[PDB]
Amino acid sequence: GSSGSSGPKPPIDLVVTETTATSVTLTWDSGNSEPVTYYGIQYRAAGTEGPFQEVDGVATTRYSIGGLSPFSEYAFRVLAVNSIGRGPPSEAVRARTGEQSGPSSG
């Protein structure tokens, strides 16, 4: 169902500026004019079709994700949340972490 706006709107300008071997820097804009409480974030090893991580407590437009593996691909998606409920996810993005750590070779 893609009809009916029951809650806040998803964030826009979803792009990453920095990418660490075990971390990533994602940025975006409020998108919604109305005052929202916080913005949740979801991500997981690019591929699996299951539940993606969940992070709550981001009262900012910029947030960095950590606890990932070096030279790996992960999908990121930020969304707004209020007393009413959490709106739909933003343009799901995919950023491949660097191989700085370099755990193994081949």
Q: Which amino acid is at 37?
A: T
How many residues comprise the chain?
A: 106
Q: Which two tokens stand for residue 72?
A: 């790996």
Query: How determined?
Result: NMR
Radius of gyration of the chain (CA): 15
Q: What φ, ψ does residue 86 adopt, rounded to 5°?
A: -85, 125
DSSP assignment of 80-93: EE-SS-B------E
Spelled out in words, what is the top-level CATH class assigned to the domain 1-106? mainly beta
Calculate ∠ Cα 94-61-72, nearest 5°. 25
Alpha carbon 30 to chain centroid distance?
13
Q: What are phi and psi of 15, to 5 degrees?
A: -145, 150
Domain-wise residue ranges, the chain: 1-106
Q: How far apart are CA 19 and CA 54, in angstroms?
A: 20
84 half-sphere exposure, CB direction, 13 A CA radius:
11
For residue 54, the one-letter residue type is E
